[PDB]
Amino acid sequence: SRRARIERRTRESDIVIELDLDGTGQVAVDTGVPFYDHMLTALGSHASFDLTVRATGDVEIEAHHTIEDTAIALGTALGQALGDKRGIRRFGDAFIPMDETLAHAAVDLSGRPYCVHTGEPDHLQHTTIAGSSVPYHTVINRHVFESLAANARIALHVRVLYGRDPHHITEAQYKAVARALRQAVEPDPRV
């Protein structure tokens, strides 16, 4: 019904997305960038999408190409799955408290790509979230949101009202986008 499968093969990466807007949060993400997997699993779950993401890319360089190519492909899938956008709420927004952090996202499924990202503390422009695998540079958060909005052809406004921990700040933003999309894609019982 509201499903899309997108395959995107570049010099740098190979991506497969399966998206259902009308899911129950059945989510499986494997990009080779485990913090990014965690963020897209939060996005898929909190959006009540069913979402499969399989990505392999040039992580010897760093995560950037894989992260960007995945967000492009996911945006393309969102736009294709929304189709004509008849009968939906269209507007959605969500506040996400995560301990000390408060984030917000507002969306308009307008067919007019726009992204505005504000309030992220300056330390996230050079922060690395590093474990035993490929690390995640938080400067990429803005890039993920612009790539999603640009390829879904939606207006996406993401705000950090305040926060300190880069993991809390990043995860609250992904969750806020997720819950804002959930509200916007839902059938509107009056239109």
Ligand X SMILES: O=P(O)(O)OC[C@@H](O)[C@@H](O)c1cnc[nH]1
| Residue pair 28/45 in contact by the 8 Å Cβ criterion | no
| Residue pair 18/30 in contact by the 8 Å Cβ criterion | no
Phi, psi of 146 (to 5 degrees): -65, -40
Phi, psi of 24 (to 5 degrees): -125, 25
Window contacting its own copies (CB under 8 A); options: 1-9, 13-21, 76-84, 142-150: 142-150
Residue 117 interacting entry, from Mn ion, ligand X, its own copies, none, C-beta within 5 to 8 Å by type: none
Please check if 136 is assigned to a binding site: no
Please check if 170 is assigned to a binding site: yes
Give residues 38-97 in contact with Mn ion (rule: CB under 5 A): 68
Please check if 167 is assigned to a binding site: yes
CA distances from 94 to 26, 159, 162, 171, 176 (A): 21, 10, 15, 13, 5
State in angstroms the smallest separation of the CB of 48 from Mn ion.
19
Among 71, 81, 167, 181, which residue interacts with its own copies (rule: CB under 8 A)?
167
Contact status: 146 vs Mn ion (CB under 5 A) = no
State in angstroms the smallest separation of the CB of 21 from ligand X.
20
Using CB under 8 A, count the residues that bind its own copies.
Answer: 66
Rounded distance, CA 116 to CA 74, Å? 19
Contact status: 48 vs its own copies (CB under 8 A) = yes
DSSP 48: T
Please check if 137 is assigned to a binding site: no
